[PDB]
Write a protein that binds this ligand. Structure first.
Ligand SMILES: O=C(Cc1ccccc1)Nc1cccc(Cl)c1
Length: 186
């Protein structure tokens, strides 16, 4: 099946807890995979304009680890619940992808999660201005704009709204798309 195939592909790239005990400032992100209309999608947030760091930027749900978290996956799920109302029964964490090093002292761990088909986002407006889906296949043939660094522009065909996706968020989206969609019979 599509979903069993995606999970099997993802598991091959799982690094597990290999880098998780290293003494960094630790953040986790959840890369939420949603199946709609027979295709996989990634769920993205737009950060609230009122936030002091990266207002209005497209990001995956996530945030800083706190003492309550049993592990890095827990961080991702806690923050996703706070930001978009995703409850733990509504997500299956499939793997941990390569972590992202930034600022010399920070490690961001991405987890891919399969999201329940009955989940409906409840954007928390203190943190999230918007939530939207992008088909995973888009990241194989993105509309690229150079600002010099590469920016993806995705227009939602439902409403014509264009979102800019860049940086770590864009990079991770492409990674997930490659992992899941490469070398597939039509
Ligand atoms: O903050 C993140 C994930 C993240 C973690 C670490 C570095 C870069 C992105 N995501 C998010 C998205 C919407 C609202 C809020 Cl409050 C946070």
């Amino acid at each position: 099946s599509m979903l069993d195939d995606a999970k099997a592909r993802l598991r091959k790239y799982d690094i597990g807890g290999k880098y998780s005990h290293l003494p960094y400032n630790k953040y986790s992100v959840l890369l939420p995979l949603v199946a709609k209309e027979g295709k996989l999608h990634l769920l993205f947030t737009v950060r609230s304009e009122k936030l002091r760091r990266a207002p209005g930027e497209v990001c995956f749900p996530g945030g800083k680890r706190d003492p309550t978290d049993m592990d890095d996956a827990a961080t991702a799920l806690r923050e996703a619940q706070e930001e978009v109302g995703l409850r733990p029964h509504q997500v299956e964490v499939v793997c941990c992808l390569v972590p992202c090093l930034i600022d010399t002292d920070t490690l961001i761990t991405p987890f891919v999660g399969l999201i329940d088909h009955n989940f409906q986002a409840q954007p928390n407006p203190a943190e999230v201005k918007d939530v939207f889906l992008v088909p995973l296949a888009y990241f194989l043939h993105p509309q690229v704009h150079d600002q010099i660094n590469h920016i993806f522009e995705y227009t939602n065909p439902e409403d014509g709204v264009t979102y800019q996706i860049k940086g770590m968020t864009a990079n991770l989206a492409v990674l997930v798309a490659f992992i899941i969609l490469e070398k597939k019979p039509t």
